[PDB]
Amino acid sequence: HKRRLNALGPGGLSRERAGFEVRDVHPSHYGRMCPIETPEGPNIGLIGSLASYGRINPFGFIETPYRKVVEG
DNA sequence: CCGGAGCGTTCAGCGTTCGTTTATCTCCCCCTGGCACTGTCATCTCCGTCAGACCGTCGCA
């Protein structure tokens, strides 16, 4: 419940306004939003749990850590 | 051997006390009316439906 990101609410995308494209798993969700767990009721994909290693920008974008690779 | 006294019950004279009303006196509620320097145009809505149809509407042809 602490980690849930809720796409609904005031000033947000409502359930009647939801479509297939916004519910589905995007390739950019890797490390930023869990593709597995989400409420399986009427709001599939809209509410989703943050990833384990996810961090949040000051702006509000979700980061994820990667090890730098130099010269192989 | 009835006669009287005492006792049981049951009623007519006036004498007081109730049952139910009435207008007057405080406290409160409720509605209409007064305010006189000037003061003369608000308000945020609404977006990441949605899916296509039904329909009238409307300017171009």
Swiss-Prot record:
Coiled coil: none annotated. DNA-dependent RNA polymerase catalyzes the transcription of DNA into RNA using the four ribonucleoside triphosphates as substrates. The RNAP catalytic core consists of 2 alpha, 1 beta, 1 beta' and 1 omega subunit. When a sigma factor is associated with the core the holoenzyme is formed, which can initiate transcription. The RNAP complex including the principal sigma factor HrdB also interacts with RNA-binding protein RbpA. Belongs to the RNA polymerase beta chain family. This is DNA-directed RNA polymerase subunit beta. It comes from Streptomyces coelicolor (strain ATCC BAA-471 / A3(2) / M145). The gene is rpoB. The chain holds residues 437 to 508 of 1161 of the full protein.
